[PDB]
Amino acid sequence: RSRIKWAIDYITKYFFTEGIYLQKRQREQRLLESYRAEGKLGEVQCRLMEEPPDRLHVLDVGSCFNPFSSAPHLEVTALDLCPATEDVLQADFLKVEVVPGIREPELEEGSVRRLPASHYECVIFSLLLEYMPSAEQRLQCCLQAYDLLLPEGILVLITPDAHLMKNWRYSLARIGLLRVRFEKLPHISCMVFRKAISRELSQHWASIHREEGMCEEIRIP
């Protein structure tokens, strides 16, 4: 049906109705034991989420009109370069700093310039990344998404219309994000990437699944 309904349903299942965050945690714990048992990794640091709050902190980037704000149990901060509705904060995400030690966005001259680090259970890039000028700026957005996420939070990535998705999967794994869902909807590909319990775990996964010819960034032809 709709990417919006698809994403609300996934988020709800991931944190509430299906505990997918706990399922993937187990998969990642087993993967780490496998790697340690092969001497390829040592004593890495792991960071886990507490039980989800009743109200999830969701950052909707390139939101346009804040579709997610009325979804139950989502507390949505919506940003857009050119907001269409008054409830979307103006921001060029490429110029946003991710700042530890703050609780809410800070604005200068009416533009979001700073967001709280490690604060959001969910970051949503719905048909946003194809607006970036370069491949390296698409990666930059996902790197900011990673500093914004709580441990085991999820990046919801929706892009318009296989080896390229394997490349994005590899590129995002290099920076700590492991894909946990991929679904094809009419005219779009719907993906969710999870902030792994350990970035080093994610990077080693990517090392193993690197095919020859693929870049470190995330590309749009």
Ligand X SMILES: C[S@@+](CC[C@H](N)C(=O)[O-])C[C@H]1O[C@@H](n2cnc3c(N)ncnc32)[C@H](O)[C@@H]1O
Binding residues, as ranges, are: 3, 62, 80-81, 92-93, 126
- For residue 156, the minimal CB distance to ligand X (Å) is 10
Q: Which is nearer to ligand X, 9 or 92 (CB)?
A: 92
Query: What is d(CA 104, CA 89) in angstroms, rounded to the nearest whole number?
Result: 12
Interactions with ligand X, residue window 126-145 (CB under 6 A):
126-128, 131
Q: Which is nearer to ligand X, 66 or 198 (CB)?
A: 66
Query: What is d(CA 189, CA 161) in angstroms, rounded to the nearest whole number?
Result: 7
Q: Which is nearer to ligand X, 18 or 131 (CB)?
A: 131
Interactions with ligand X, residue window 161-220 (CB under 6 A):
none
**Quick count: other Cβ atoms within 10 Å of Cβ 125?**
24
Distance of CA 207 to the CA centre of its chain: 20
Q: Which is nearer to ligand X, 63 or 167 (CB)?
A: 63
Burial 187-211 (b: 16+ CB within 10 A, else e): ebbbbbbbbbbbbbbbbbbbeeebe
CB 111, CB 49: distance < 8 Å: no
Annotated binding site for S-adenosyl-L-homocysteine: 3, 62, 80, 92-93, 126
Interactions with ligand X, residue window 74-103 (CB under 6 A):
79-82, 91-94
Per-residue tokens: 153? 């939070």
Per-residue tokens: 63? 């939101």
Q: Report the interface residues with ligand X, using CB under 6 A.
A: 3, 61-64, 79-82, 91-94, 126-128, 131
